Amino acid sequence: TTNTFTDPPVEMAKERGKTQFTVRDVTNFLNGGEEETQIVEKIMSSIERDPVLSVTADYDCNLQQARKQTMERVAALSPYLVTDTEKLSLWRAQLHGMVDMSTRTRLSIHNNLFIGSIRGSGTPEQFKYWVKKGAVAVKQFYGCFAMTELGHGSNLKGLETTATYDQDSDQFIINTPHIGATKWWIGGAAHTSTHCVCFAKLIVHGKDYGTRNFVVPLRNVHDHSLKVGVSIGDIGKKMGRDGVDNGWIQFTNVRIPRQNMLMRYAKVSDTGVVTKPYGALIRGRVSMIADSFHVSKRFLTIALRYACVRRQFGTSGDTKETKIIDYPYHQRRLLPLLAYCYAMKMGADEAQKTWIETTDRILALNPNDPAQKNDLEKAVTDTKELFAASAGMKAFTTWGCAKIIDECRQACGGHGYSGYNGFGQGYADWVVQCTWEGDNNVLCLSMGRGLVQSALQILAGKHVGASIQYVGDKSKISQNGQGTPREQLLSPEFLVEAFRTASRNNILRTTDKYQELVKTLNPDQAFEELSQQRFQCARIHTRQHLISSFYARIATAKDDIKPHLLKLANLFALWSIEEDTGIFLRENILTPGDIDLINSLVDELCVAVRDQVIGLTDAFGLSDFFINAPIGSYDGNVYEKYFAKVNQQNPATNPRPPYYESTLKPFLFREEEDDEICDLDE
Amino acid sequence: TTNTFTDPPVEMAKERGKTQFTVRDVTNFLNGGEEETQIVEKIMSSIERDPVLSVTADYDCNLQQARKQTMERVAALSPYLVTDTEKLSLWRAQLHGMVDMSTRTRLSIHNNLFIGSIRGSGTPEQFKYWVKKGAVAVKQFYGCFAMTELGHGSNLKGLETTATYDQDSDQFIINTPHIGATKWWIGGAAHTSTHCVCFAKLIVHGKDYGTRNFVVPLRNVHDHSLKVGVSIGDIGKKMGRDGVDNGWIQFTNVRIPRQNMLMRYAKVSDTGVVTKPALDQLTYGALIRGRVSMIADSFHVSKRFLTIALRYACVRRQFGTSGDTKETKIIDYPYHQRRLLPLLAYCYAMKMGADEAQKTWIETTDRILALNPNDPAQKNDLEKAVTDTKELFAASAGMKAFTTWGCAKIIDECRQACGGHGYSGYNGFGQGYADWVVQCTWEGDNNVLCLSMGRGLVQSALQILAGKHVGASIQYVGDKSKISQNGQGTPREQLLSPEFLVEAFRTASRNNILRTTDKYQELVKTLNPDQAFEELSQQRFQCARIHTRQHLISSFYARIATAKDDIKPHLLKLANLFALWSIEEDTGIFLRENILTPGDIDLINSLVDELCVAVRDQVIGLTDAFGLSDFFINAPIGSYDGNVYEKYFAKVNQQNPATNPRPPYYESTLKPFLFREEEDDEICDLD
Ligand SMILES: Cc1cc2nc3c(=O)[nH]c(=O)nc-3n(C[C@H](O)[C@H](O)[C@H](O)COP(=O)(O)OP(=O)(O)OC[C@H]3O[C@@H](n4cnc5c(N)ncnc54)[C@H](O)[C@@H]3O)c2cc1C
Ligand SMILES: Cc1cc2nc3c(=O)[nH]c(=O)nc-3n(C[C@H](O)[C@H](O)[C@H](O)COP(=O)(O)OP(=O)(O)OC[C@H]3O[C@@H](n4cnc5c(N)ncnc54)[C@H](O)[C@@H]3O)c2cc1C
Structure with missing residues (x-):
């Protein structure tokens, strides 16, 4: 009735059949409303129609x-x-x-x-x-x-x-x-x-x-x-x-x-x-947060579509092998990446908004026009802190995109290595995105140092950026060894606290180390000694900011979509714990027992997101032109289109290489020079 | 006397004067003796000199x-x-x-x-x-x-x-x-x-x-x-x-x-x-050869790109102050050291892995090929040759996967470590990574290979629990850990001890395996073995990962034990760096398991910093110790003599003579475009 070759388009049809929401609502949520989704769709049509711009x-x-x-x-x-x-x-x-x-x-x-x-x-x-x-x-x-x-x-x-x-x-x-x-x-x-x-x-x-x-x-x-x-x-x-x-x-x-x-x-x-x-340099980094998102979504769409139709290895006694998307191991490798890709967009969007709401804050004030005072360098300080945060955001999201391209490629097996599936070409250009406009590693080190600086300002009781005020806080959370319950671990409010807490602790621990160091060393020297700690602090602080920003947006989301986005947001927040188990354990925010429960919660959230993947990837609103890979066709008709592609670009009429006469034939048919040995007397 | 352009070779000569040991003694340690190095040198001059093979x-x-x-x-x-x-x-x-x-x-x-x-x-x-x-x-x-x-x-x-x-x-x-x-x-x-x-x-x-x-x-x-x-x-x-x-x-x-x-x-x-x-899985016998051969590739290609990056680190300056206002050498910044030097130790360890695996493949297939399966007498000889090949299969698979992923990561970290000059094709990273990466996929998809080793490790544990015989490699899974922590911290002396690190790693591995073997037993009460392992897929990965990492760390120390004495202490530094750095990626795993306390993590971080500083002093010697001529470097910024900028500018100009300032599409594309006439939006007439 169906074979390996013809099964895929059918299977892709059942999956698009599982979708419980209106895709375009998630598209309007991502792009920031109906008006903009139509903005980007006129853009996209220009590109894809124009013959000169074709990428085939x-x-x-x-x-x-x-x-x-x-x-x-x-x-x-x-x-x-x-x-x-x-x-x-x-x-x-x-x-x-x-593309x-x-x-x-x-x-x-x-x-x-x-x-x-x-x-x-x-x-x-x-x-x-x-x-x-x-x-x-x-x-x-x-x-x-x-x-x-x-x-x-x-x-x-x-x-x-x-x-x-x-x-x-x-x-x-x-x-x-x-x-x-x-x-x-x-x-x-x-x-x-x-x-x-x-x-x-x-x-x-x-x-x-x-x-x-x-x-x-x-x-x-x-x-x-x-x-x-x-x-x-x-x-x-x-x-x-x-x-x-x-x-x-x-x-x-x-x-x-x-x-x-x-x-x-x-x-x-x-x-x-x-x-x-200034503005140019920040409106350039915020541009790359959004870049990480646009490119990532392409390669997730490819990989996840493929996973919905690729079958390898099943144990269930059923006639057909298991679709690899139905293996929890595979869901673990890609679905938290899908969640991450959603949160980059949020992150990018929020950094544009907070950027405009602060350059408005400075300009609406009279710097020259003191109300007898200029006392508002606080607006000025908030701006510098935003500029710090944008540095970590650029670094870790461009790294994350890079990491997603690579995981998605590997997730398509050997077919991930075919040039026609796009992974090779796409990884290289993206790596340049990690070096230019601020070497990601320099950026993170600068941000970390800025963070230490900012905590010394808190310890000295002075105003700091809104975005890092939280280091001045006390934690809602204390673990006495009595491990956290499920309804805590599935709470956004709780989860947001845990990360802010881990991020505060790290920063405060660094900050303490630094002051203690300064007793024997110079300020520039003491940072060099705490550079790993400084890099960690950039890491945790950017992630927590990303976690919050994703929840903060769900709350404003259309109700029909909201339960699904929440499932994506939770996966991102809990998964993030799992990648940092050692960190949460060091502060004793969580316990061992607790992480075996985190383990099961991502499992469980994988199956949920898994159910809606075609929907949550169709949400990105990409035509097959922008996919530009036959294994990521909307259709799901994967093997057929991939073969067609391979044959279109490489016509196979001739069984011999163009170098057949020059090289291959004269090598296969080579003569033997003699093993005869020169005459000698005695 | 020097500027940015002329400084690098002067700096490289200085760096190379710091070397405390005879480079060829480390090279001999890596190759398994002077005889092997000589044979390795003979191969490499043939490859270097043959003009058909030139990679310029x-x-x-x-x-x-x-x-x-x-x-x-x-x-x-x-x-x-x-x-x-x-x-x-x-x-x-x-x-x-x-190359x-x-x-x-x-x-x-x-x-x-x-x-x-x-x-x-x-x-x-x-x-x-x-x-x-x-x-x-x-x-x-x-x-x-x-x-x-x-x-x-x-x-x-x-x-x-x-x-x-x-x-x-x-x-x-x-x-x-x-x-x-x-x-x-x-x-x-x-x-x-x-x-x-x-x-x-x-x-x-x-x-x-x-x-x-x-x-x-x-x-x-x-x-x-x-x-x-x-x-x-x-x-x-x-x-x-x-x-x-x-x-x-x-x-x-x-x-x-x-x-x-x-x-x-x-x-x-x-x-x-x-x-x-069959009574055999020896239809895929040829695949094991190359999985074994892939552990070595991982060493060989890693050592090439770590040498490019680290020679460049010793000469590149960004952001410093100095007596003559020269900026700091990127290799003197502590973060750059921790980006590269642990990877240098990883790489040295890969060779220890590659050699064990190699000695066993060559030994095992002598035995297999010399056996006749049509002889009833020889049925007990081959009975062991099969279990030898089974064990070899499983060991090769996890070591292939992790070593080829580790190479992927090294090539990638070295590229960024060179900044924008890492993105120039001539410095090799691009062709390198793109060519390297298929190794993580072919002759066994790595993830699936990890699942196979995880399964083999569970099955080895059951043999052990049954008291039956098992490979030397997996014996430790049987033992009780020699370490227990009452939460009062681990001192510095233990944390710099080979025995302790090994034992720490074996303990982390054994416990994961023994736990996973526990869940499996519970599962086989309803499920078939197959369905159980799939339930345990994430667990199988974890076990492959820790046990492999424990194997390499252990294999590196086992070889450092046998070294010439003059090199032993520098090699020791690399080992402990590799070990402690590995704790540093898997910090969760060692606190999960009550092996280290939170207060030990602070201490681990400092020790890594120390070990790096000590290994940094000798980077040129260890990299030199690889034995690569400039042909196998195949990258201007990885030149032996360190004249990075001259050679890089020369390579670029030699491959792209610049005598024409127009492109081949000047007349057809660029000129017509730039000199395009004005579009007339003069509107039509209408009443
Ligand atoms: C450059 C190149 C050259 C090659 N040359 C040759 C050659 O000369 N000869 C030859 O025979 N072959 C060759 N191959 C094929 C190569 O061996 C295959 O790519 C490799 O075996 C992977 O198989 P696959 O793509 O079918 O992956 P699949 O097995 O389809 O796997 C796809 C994805 O699903 C995941 N997955 C699969 N099963 C499971 C499971 N049970 N649980 C969880 N996850 C799972 C995998 O991790 C993978 O990420 C070549 C491949 C390449 C890329
Ligand atoms: C494809 C491409 C296109 C480009 N196009 C342009 C262009 O059009 N115009 C233009 O002006 N430029 C361009 N550039 C240059 C690009 O901006 C630079 O590559 C980048 O800004 C800086 O890289 P670098 O080579 O200076 O690296 P460096 O700054 O030398 O860094 C070298 C390495 O050392 C590390 N390092 C540096 N400083 C420190 C420190 N203080 N502490 C710790 N570690 C440190 C870095 O992390 C890096 O890994 C381009 C680059 C590329 C790759």
């Missing part, structure tokens, strides 16, 4: 093909640069970034980083000028963002490129003093760009005034050749995003007008330097 | 270029198939796989999987016959291994391809009943193999006798065309190992003679009686 064949492209295709795609996407608002421009990017991270980046380098920066750091006259030149329209103008150097990436303050003021010419002289200063990883430079935003040390009359930005032209627009003193090359093969043309730039005494420097925050005239002694 | 341009290769050059490389390695011993063959494949996984696999499917199956499952005459037809020499013959189907990977008993016996003709009819039984991922099938070993359900008189082994010709050897009823295509793009031509195979009423079925253990007469049932 991207997996077989070699490096040359990818670059050219990315360029064509960028040309295709350019009309939306005039149309799109900041929200839409960014949204278009993130959604297109699920094509090369084009996203080749376009983002100009319209997000170059433009971002000359709007951000240029005076209104300047921005206006570059626009007249073609900047925004991208006519005869393509930009790029030259910050990083071969020798410096993380340390902006350490950059060695120089910009020296020459009054006799009224120009800047841009110079790379040696090859260590060579600009590096600059997207669009190798082959695309006609201008960059160079980041350079400001030098005037032999003084260093720190790092500034300059608009350096690289190419003569009309034949694309390099300007005098500009050297550029192609960085070449990368681990991923081979469609982006990252190059190196070296400047040998390049002369630009003084005016080319961007002077919103710092000015030069006639040797005079007037600094008049 | 490999990062830049498209799939069609990889495909072709892998074939050339396979050709150039083929003389060694006739002269190599088992040990040389293993080692030549392992060492070459450090070229595609050729390693493409050679391996014939010479490891295909050949191993005919030796291990064919009679001596059956083997001699294919030998004489070119099989071993690779003359007019290329083999492959057709086990996996689209439908089935892990469950070999559920394979759907059939081999149904036909007495009228004395043939097997090999048939793929639907697209789901299409053989899948078959290395060499797409383009190169002439013959396959194909696994199928042996059907005689309407009865399935289970999964059996047959040699099936795939192609006409003189023009390479497909034989009648044989259908093949190319699976195409993989995540890595693109030089390997993995194909799919469908059979439609393909006739082979009956003598093509491999009949060392299972037989079928010309009348159709399945003369014997």
Whole structure:
């Protein structure tokens, strides 16, 4: 009646049959309402219809093909640069970034980083000028963002490129003093760009005034050749995003007008330097929280769809083997990952909201206009703390996405290794997402230190950010050895407390260690000695914030969905205990007996979520174009489509390799040279 | 005197002056003596110098270029198939796989999987016959291994391809009943193999006798065309190992003679009686070889990427202050040490594992191959050889899984440890990880391999409870722990003791196994064994994991006991670091079990910090101790002499000469775009 080949689409039909809610309600919940789900669906249709942007064949492209295709795609996407608002421009990017991270980046380098920066750091006259030149329209103008150097990436303050003021010419002289200063990883430079935003040390009359930005032209627009003193090359093969043309730039005494420097925050005239002694960087990290979500959901959808139809190994005496989604072991490997992926979106969303509700808080206040007082640096402090929290959020969610890609791949067995299922291509581009815009490990160490700082402010009884006030708290919870009951362990209120408690304890323990250390050591030294502890504190503090933010959203959810989201939220919170059993045991928040009960609670919550997976993955609202993997087809018709794919991209008419005559045949049919041995007397 | 560009080699020479020991003594310790090191060096210069095998341009290769050059490389390695011993063959494949996984696999499917199956499952005459037809020499013959189907990977008993016996003709009819039984991922099938070993359900008189082994010709050897009823295509793009031509195979009423079925253990007469049932799981005998060989790969590839990362750590500076305003060396920041150095210790430990497993595979298959199963006298000899292979199966499986996952993690942590320079193809991490990762899937999916070891460990516990004999490896499961904690803490002296750490680990493992064996007993009262183990799947994983980790820690100490004295203390530091760091991942497990107190965790963290600082002083020596030339590094930032930036800039420019500032799509794509005319929204006229 059905065989292995034909069973899958049928089985996928029973599972979509189990769904107890309206999918689109979960889609509106994720995306933040009916209005936005229709916003993202117009975006998605543009992308998927457009023939130029098609991704069917991207997996077989070699490096040359990818670059050219990315360029064509960028040309295709350019009309939306005039149309799109900041929200839409960014949204278009993130959604297109699920299947094509090369084009996203080749376009983002100009319209997000170059433009971002000359709007951000240029005076209104300047921005206006570059626009007249073609900047925004991208006519005869393509930009790029030259910050990083071969020798410096993380340390902006350490950059060695120089910009020296020459009054006799009224120009800047841009110079790379040696090859260590060579600009590096600059997207669009190798082959695309006609201008960059160079980041350079400001030098005037032999003084260093720190790092500034300059608009350096690289190419003569009309034949694309390099300007005098500009050297550029192609960085070449990368681990991923081979469609982006990252190059190196070296400047040998390049002369630009003084005016080319961007002077919103710092000015030069006639040797005079007037600094008049942020949002972009945070609206960039919050953008990546949402990135982790968009990409993750793709690979979970693939893996979980596959699990609903793949059968291997069953013991139940039934005629057909067990669907791997019905193995609790498999549910453990993926369903808490599905829960996590939900909470990234919440987390991303809440960080945008708290960000706007604080930059409004500062601006609605008169800093200059003291009500006889400026006493509200408290609004200012809350902002810095939010900026700390966004750092851990970027790090752990980009790591989490990375970890989800890898688990989902492994969960599809050998078929996870086929290029047509997307796991290979998708992991590499994403790993670049872990390094740029703040090295995840630097970020976490900074945040941890900031957290210690903040607790010393609490210990000194001063105001701190809303987001870390909780370290000043006393716990609702005390474990006397009398282990926690089920109705506690399934409580969001309880669960939120447990994590805040574990996070507070850690921080307070670190903080104590540090003060005690400081007795024999310097402040910078004492942090180095507590760097593991600092990293842990970033970890626990970000997770708890994520747990809370997920519950805080369920409460506002439509009732029909709510019981299901709660099941997802509980799985995420309890699972999180299991990954950190040692932590909760060290504070004696929980007991051994207790964790064997946690064990059973995730089991039990796995079976519940499991029941509704097709629904909770159809919720992401992805067409098969955005899946871009035959084993994750909405259809479930997995083996049929995968074979079709393999045959479409690789026509098998010929049984021999193109190297058959040159290589294979002459090796299989090789003669033997003689084993005869030279004559010798005696 | 120095700048960012010229500083690294000066720093590397300084770092390398700190070494307290003779590097080659550690290298000898890792290889099992100076003789072994000499043999290892002989293999490596052959690989280094042979211009067909050069990997300089490999990062830049498209799939069609990889495909072709892998074939050339396979050709150039083929003389060694006739002269190599088992040990040389293993080692030549392992060492070459450090930097070229595609050729390693493409050679391996014939010479490891295909050949191993005919030796291990064919009679001596059956083997001699294919030998004489070119099989071993690779003359007019290329083999492959057709086990996996689209439908089935892990469950070999559920394979759907059939081999149904036909007495009228004395043939097997090999048939793929639907697209789901299409053989899948078959290395060499797409383009190169002439013959396959194909696994199928042996059907005689309407009865399935289970999964059996047959040699099936795939192609006409003189023009390479497909034989009648044989259908093949190319699976195409993989995540890595693109030089390997993995194909799919469908059979439609393909006739082979009956003598093509491999009949060392299972037989079928010309009348159709399945003369014997196997009494063996030795249809998959060849798979054990390479699981064993995968423990070593994990060491060899780990040691390559830890050397890249850690040499780079010693020269890269970000954020520091110093007498001349030089920034700090990333290796001097304590977090970076804890990211890498415990992984360095892991890696050293992997080699201890790889060697045990290797010594047993080579020993065990001498015994197996020298036994005749058609001798009644020899029935008690083979009776032990079977249980030897069973134990070996189980031990290899968990060690394969965890060591290949640990390598995956090392490659990945080393990549990030190099920052953005880890993402450059030329520094090797990308091709490396993508090529490495299939090892966690093939020749046994790791998770499923963990489930198999978990089961074997429960069954070993029952033997123990029955007082019956068990391998030295698992004996400790029997004993009572020598440690008890009344909650007053564990001192520093015990926490730096090999005996204590070992015992701590054995205690954590034994208790999980003994508990899991407890639940199983309760379950077998209603359930069958099978259904019980599936209920215990999560438990089986846990046990595999701890016992494996306990095995490696124990094996590392057992070798440190035998070392030259001058190196022993540095090797000791790595061991305890590995051990204590391992407590640090599994902190839950040791507090769950009342082995450590909460107040011991603080202390463990500090000790890790100390051990790191001590191991950091000698990183160049230990990494040097691997014995890798720059060819096997294959990464500018991992250069021996540390001139990271010069070599990195040179590699990039050499592979991408920059004399043209336009792209190949300038005239067709970029210029037309950038110089596109204005869109006229001049509106139509209307009244
Ligand atoms: C694909 C790609 C595209 C890029 N595109 C651009 C671009 O368009 N424009 C641009 O300007 N840049 C670009 N970059 C550069 C990118 O921003 C850098 O890779 C990153 O910002 C910093 O990396 P790094 O190489 O400086 O690493 P480093 O900062 O040197 O870090 C090296 C390692 O040491 C560790 N480390 C560093 N400091 C510390 C510390 N204080 N304590 C402990 N550990 C530490 C880090 O964790 C890291 O693992 C790109 C990079 C990539 C990979
Ligand atoms: C590059 C490459 C080359 C290959 N070359 C060859 C070759 O030359 N010859 C050959 O014969 N084969 C080859 N294979 C096949 C390879 O051995 C299979 O991928 C491997 O055996 C895994 O099988 P599978 O994909 O069927 O996984 P499945 O068994 O289908 O498993 C899918 C997922 O379900 C999980 N799962 C399965 N069963 C259970 C259970 N009982 N409980 C809980 N979870 C479970 C697994 O962990 C896995 O994550 C190759 C594969 C690759 C990727």
